[PDB]
Amino acid sequence: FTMDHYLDIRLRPDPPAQLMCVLFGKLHQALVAQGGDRIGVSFPDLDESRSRLGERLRIHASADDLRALLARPWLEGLRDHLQFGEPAVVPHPTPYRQVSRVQAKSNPERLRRRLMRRHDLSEEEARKRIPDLDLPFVTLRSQSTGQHFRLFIRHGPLQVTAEEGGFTCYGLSKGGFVPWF
RNA sequence: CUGCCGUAUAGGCAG
Known part of the structure; x- marks a missing residue:
């Protein structure tokens, strides 16, 4: 498994969620x-x-x-x-x-x-067809339009072996898994 | 939030 290095970064007091x-x-x-x-x-x-x-x-x-x-x-x-x-x-x-x-x-x-x-x-048609998440998240800003949005993150089931897939430019899975410890 | 993929009121995705 090739992604076998890591760095831990921990927050120092100041608030934690915002940091x-x-x-x-x-x-x-x-x-x-x-x-x-x-x-x-x-x-x-x-x-x-x-x-x-x-x-x-x-x-x-x-x-x-x-x-x-x-x-x-x-x-x-x-x-x-x-x-x-x-x-x-x-x-x-x-x-x-x-x-x-x-x-x-x-x-x-x-x-x-x-x-x-x-x-x-x-709209009345649409409203008839399409009538009226509990995860941790970070709140990010859409750099193109200045709109803030929540990005919800799931840590999935543990497993014994890894995967071949990659990762997004937020570091989140596009198929890839990471070691858990 | 806004948008994209999809017949989808399927399942995904982008910042």
Whole structure:
């Protein structure tokens, strides 16, 4: 399994939820800049039982990809509000799990607008057809339109072996799993 | 939130 290195970043007091969002956004910028699909995240102090991500962000990658990511100054500026481990090989063996963005059909009105574009119906028709998530999340800003949105994250069932797939520019699964420990 | 894929009131996705 090739994404066998990691770095833990822990939040330092100041508020925690807001700080994690800034950190996660900075990571996104860095991933977009690098353009790859082989850097993953997990939240090892997760409390799914309270929809809390916890205060530890773990970054997962090959040795070379982690080194390249960390070489960029994407953290300087936040550095004083973070505490760092050392980039390291993961323990082994460990289970693996998938850390995924989850989306839902949470707004029927938006569905109706699309359905109207796709079937030339009217709102009353659409409203008849399409009548009126409990996960941790980060709140991000849509850099193109300045709209804030919640990105909900699921840590899936543990399993014994890994996967071949990659990751998005938020570090979330596009098929890939990360070691869980 | 806004949009994309899909006949979908199927299942996904983008920022």
